[PDB]
Amino acid sequence: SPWFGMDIGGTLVKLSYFEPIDITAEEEQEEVESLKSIRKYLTSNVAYGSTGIRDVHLELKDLTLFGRRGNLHFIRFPTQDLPTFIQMGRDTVLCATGGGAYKFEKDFRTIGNLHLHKLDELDCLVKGLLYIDSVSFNGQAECYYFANASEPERCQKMPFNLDDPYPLLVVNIGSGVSILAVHSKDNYKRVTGTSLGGGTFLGLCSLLTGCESFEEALEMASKGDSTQADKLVRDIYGGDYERFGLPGWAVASSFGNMIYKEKRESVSKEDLARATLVTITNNIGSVARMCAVNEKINRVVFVGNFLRVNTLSMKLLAYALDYWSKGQLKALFLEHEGYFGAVGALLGLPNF
Amino acid sequence: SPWFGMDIGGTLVKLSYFEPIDITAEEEQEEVESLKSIRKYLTSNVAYGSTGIRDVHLELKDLTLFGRRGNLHFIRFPTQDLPTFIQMGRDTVLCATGGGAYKFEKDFRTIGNLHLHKLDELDCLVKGLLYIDSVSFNGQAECYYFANASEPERCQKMPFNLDDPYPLLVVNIGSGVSILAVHSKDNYKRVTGTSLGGGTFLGLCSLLTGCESFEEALEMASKGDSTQADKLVRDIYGGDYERFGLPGWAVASSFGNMIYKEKRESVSKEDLARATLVTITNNIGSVARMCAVNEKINRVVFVGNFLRVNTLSMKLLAYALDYWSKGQLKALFLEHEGYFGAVGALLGLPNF
Numbered sequence: 001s002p003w004f005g006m007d008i009g010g011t012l013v014k015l016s017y018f019e020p021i022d023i024t025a026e027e028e029q030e031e032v033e034s035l036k037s038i039r040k041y042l043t044s045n046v047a048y049g050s051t052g053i054r055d056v057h058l059e060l061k062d063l064t065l066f067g068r069r070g071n072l073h074f075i076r077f078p079t080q081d082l083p084t085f086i087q088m089g090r091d092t093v094l095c096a097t098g099g100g101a102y103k104f105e106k107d108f109r110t111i112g113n114l115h116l117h118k119l120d121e122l123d124c125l126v127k128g129l130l131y132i133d134s135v136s137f138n139g140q141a142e143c144y145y146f147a148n149a150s151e152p153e154r155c156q157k158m159p160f161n162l163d164d165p166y167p168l169l170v171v172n173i174g175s176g177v178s179i180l181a182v183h184s185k186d187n188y189k190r191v192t193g194t195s196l197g198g199g200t201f202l203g204l205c206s207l208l209t210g211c212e213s214f215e216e217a218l219e220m221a222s223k224g225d226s227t228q229a230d231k232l233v234r235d236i237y238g239g240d241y242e243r244f245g246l247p248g249w250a251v252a253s254s255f256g257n258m259i260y261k262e263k264r265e266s267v268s269k270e271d272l273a274r275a276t277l278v279t280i281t282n283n284i285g286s287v288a289r290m291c292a293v294n295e296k297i298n299r300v301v302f303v304g305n306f307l308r309v310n311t312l313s314m315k316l317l318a319y320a321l322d323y324w325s326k327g328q329l330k331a332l333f334l335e336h337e338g339y340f341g342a343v344g345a346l347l348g349l350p351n352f
Numbered sequence: 353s354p355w356f357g358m359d360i361g362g363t364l365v366k367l368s369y370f371e372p373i374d375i376t377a378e379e380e381q382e383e384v385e386s387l388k389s390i391r392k393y394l395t396s397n398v399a400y401g402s403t404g405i406r407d408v409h410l411e412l413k414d415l416t417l418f419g420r421r422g423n424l425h426f427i428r429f430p431t432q433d434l435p436t437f438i439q440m441g442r443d444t445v446l447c448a449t450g451g452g453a454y455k456f457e458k459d460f461r462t463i464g465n466l467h468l469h470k471l472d473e474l475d476c477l478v479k480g481l482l483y484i485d486s487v488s489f490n491g492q493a494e495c496y497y498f499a500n501a502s503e504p505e506r507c508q509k510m511p512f513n514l515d516d517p518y519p520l521l522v523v524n525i526g527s528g529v530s531i532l533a534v535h536s537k538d539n540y541k542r543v544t545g546t547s548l549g550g551g552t553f554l555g556l557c558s559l560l561t562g563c564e565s566f567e568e569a570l571e572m573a574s575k576g577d578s579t580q581a582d583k584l585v586r587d588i589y590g591g592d593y594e595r596f597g598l599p600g601w602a603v604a605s606s607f608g609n610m611i612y613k614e615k616r617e618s619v620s621k622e623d624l625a626r627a628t629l630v631t632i633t634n635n636i637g638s639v640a641r642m643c644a645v646n647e648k649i650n651r652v653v654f655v656g657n658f659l660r661v662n663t664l665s666m667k668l669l670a671y672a673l674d675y676w677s678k679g680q681l682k683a684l685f686l687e688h689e690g691y692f693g694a695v696g697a698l699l700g701l702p703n704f
């Protein structure tokens with residue numbers, strides 16, 4: 001069978017596919033047409049149907065996995081379109097994680113003789129994260145941070161070494177947020193979570209602005225001024241709140257200037273998109289900061305697809321975590337941030 | 353001069369006024385007409401202008417303060433209308449706190465010879481809270497909790513004793529949220545804050561529903577179903593997430609069902625109001641829970657006017673704090689929850 005890892009989330013399905021590149025002449029003969037058709041279909045297309053995408057830039061080339069050499073591919077499509085995926089399958093052992101491995105278990109079993117093995121969402125995440133960092137990103141670091149995140153003329157992406165990754169706080173920003181404390185390869189726990197995550201950003205943005213994609217919401221936010229919607233410390237005090245070291249630019253009340261009708265009438269869609277992004281991102285950083293202090297962990301890595309093509313939120317997290325922790329916490333990011341559960345699922349294949 | 357305490361917040365001005373009731377016949381002669389006019393105006397009206405309100409039910413009767421007997425009155429009006437208040441004053445020593453004591457300092461000084469003494473927002477809060485609990489609410493408890501907050505047919509407001517109030521976590525829900533750790537009468541600190549507070553509720557509700565008052569937003573929310581907008585754990589998993597003890601009814605992504613256009617087209621304004629209330633209230637409870645665990649404090653008291661006439665949020669906090677802390681934390685509430693800074697300011701009068 002082809003080697004696949006699937007993470008069926010509330011919003012996106014993530015698929016990791018291992019393409020063997022050491023196929024012998026005998027092995028090519030013995031492979032059935034449908035199997036060759038799948039491999040050709042996946043490797044010769046970068047868009048699948050109308051909503052599937054292969055993230056070609058993330059491909060791991062010439063990886064050794066289960067004693068074979070191949071390329072590891074990363075593919076995503078909306079969970080809404082999983083019926084299309086299953087119908088294509090009907091017209092293999094599947095290691096699957098995420099909530100959808102349970103919700104859609106009966107649907108995967110409509111594919112004859114298919115064996116579905118459900119693996120835990122956060123177990124797969126930890127195993128996939130550790131694995132990808134261990135093999136590297138084609139010789140480059142998988143993990144990075146923003147150096148000098150406080151000064152915009154200096155702030156730059158830089159590699160970060162995770163050769164001894166423990167302990168680690170992992171903040172998984174998907175539809176909502178899960179926060180994990182990882183103490184060893186086999187010792188980790190879910191600290192807490194928040195429901196103010198990527199689905200809140202996308203859902204509120206769509207309600208407030210009429211955007212109809214994540215990418216459109218980010219484009220709007222890049223053009224907006226969140227301070228048109230937010231009430232800042234300086235709006236309440238006239239300046240800093242010196243006694244408690246709160247700068248005048250800090251947000252005192254998210255969307256708090258929208259209690260005034262004249263301000264609601266002047267705010268732009270772009271301002272509202274940016275205020276939504278800032279509100280969600282700052283809350284995620286603050287919850288991560290509080291969890292890191294309680295867990296006594298100083299390295300905080302952010303994963304999940306809320307941060308895909310989202311440098312605004314990454315830089316806001318880098319700056320905010322450093323600033324509000326007085327430099328005690330470090331925001332870390334990973335190149336394959338949305339796919340670790342799918343990789344971890346694939347890595348469970350030998351157990352079956 | 354009349355004895356007043358003022359807390360000028362980002363949204364509301366709160367005023368505490370001590371009405372002497374032990375006026376002698378000689379003292380009445382020696383009082384100037386304008387002073388008698390103010391006392392008559394304040395005590396014979398419950399609405400002041402178009403936006404000022406006296407909360408008559410909160411009055412403390414026959415209180416001994418600074419060696420005199422009198423009644424303590426509680427009055428509120430929008431900070432937007434402070435120019436009207438100052439103009440009435442122009443056509444006394446003022447102890448004032450809140451951000452507006454700084455922002456509007458120059459405006460108060462347009463009242464001839466008036467002495468403005470700025471006191472710290474959170475110092476006044478702690479002093480006023482301790483004072484009101486100490487004198488009682490006309491013989492009744494100032495502090496209450498919701499007994500059996502998990503079972504709706506049993507859940508009921510009950511008095512709570514704060515005779516030894518330390519330590520205490522104070523969660524001040526105004527425009528935004530400040531979280532204080534109080535270890536003694538003179539030992540307290542601001543732990544952190546969040547910008548997702550009462551102004552976020554009111555501002556987002558107004559944008560999403562067109563409501564034009566706090567009371568209207570609560571009325572809408574009382575009729576709504578937040579699960580029409582929110583994505584629940586059961587929407588992602590098909591049930592509970594057993595491995596991490598997450599019930600199917602828990603919110604996985606606030607507003608997360610609003611990423612689907614057909615759902616945005618069917619959701620009601622009341623559903624959106626209730627989702628806004630639930631989102632903000634749950635986030636406040638979660639941040640309070642994390643701060644209580646880090647501060648090693650088990651009693652969490654919620655104050656500020658986000659909870660005025662807002663039993664929905666109070667009961668949600670009571671239930672959520674108990675449930676998610678597995679019964680280790682207790683949500684406490686106070687009858688005079690919006691006015692403690694104003695009382696604390698008044699209590700600073702002898703220092704001048």
Ligand SMILES: Nc1ncnc2c1ncn2[C@@H]1O[C@H](COP(=O)(O)OP(=O)(O)NP(=O)(O)O)[C@@H](O)[C@H]1O
Pocket residue numbers: 008009010011012013098099173174175176177197198199200201202214304305306307308338588604
């Ligand atoms: N093409 C996209 N479509 C939708 N959302 C996107 C897209 N790209 C990025 N996002 C964001 O990524 C989030 C989903 O991240 P992801 O980590 O894939 O979550 P999920 O696994 O589907 N949800 P969960 O069940 O909570 O783990 C969305 O809420 C958006 O904020």
Ligand SMILES: Nc1ncnc2c1ncn2[C@@H]1O[C@H](COP(=O)(O)OP(=O)(O)NP(=O)(O)O)[C@@H](O)[C@H]1O
Pocket residue numbers: 236252360361362363364365450451525526527528529549550551552553554566656657658659660690
């Ligand atoms: N009549 C009202 N008008 C406006 N907001 C109200 C009213 N009644 C209750 N509220 C709520 O109470 C919140 C303000 O609470 P309050 O404790 O008075 O804050 P504030 O002191 O003005 N702000 P801050 O500067 O952050 O301390 C608003 O954000 C609303 O959610």
Ligand SMILES: N#Cc1ccc(N2CCN(C(=O)Cc3ccc(C4CC4)c(F)c3)CC2)nn1
Pocket residue numbers: 233236241246250251252253282283284285286289317320321322324451526527528529530544545546547549
């Ligand atoms: N990563 C990370 C990260 C990101 C943000 C963050 N913060 C957010 C801002 N904030 C506040 O206190 C907000 C505030 C300010 C002022 C008042 C009233 C006096 C008016 C409030 F009610 C509330 C500190 C914590 N913390 N961490």
Ligand SMILES: N#Cc1ccc(N2CCN(C(=O)Cc3ccc(C4CC4)c(F)c3)CC2)nn1
Pocket residue numbers: 099174175176177178192193194195197585588593598602603604605634635636637638641669672673674676
């Ligand atoms: N007072 C108080 C109080 C109130 C609420 C509260 N919580 C809010 C809910 N919550 C979550 O984890 C939410 C969640 C659930 C599921 C997933 C993914 C698996 C799909 C998430 F990304 C996120 C626990 C903490 N905590 N405290």
Ligand SMILES: [Mg+2]
Pocket residue numbers: 009010098174175
């Ligand atoms: Mg996920």
Ligand SMILES: [Mg+2]
Pocket residue numbers: 361362450526527
């Ligand atoms: Mg206040």
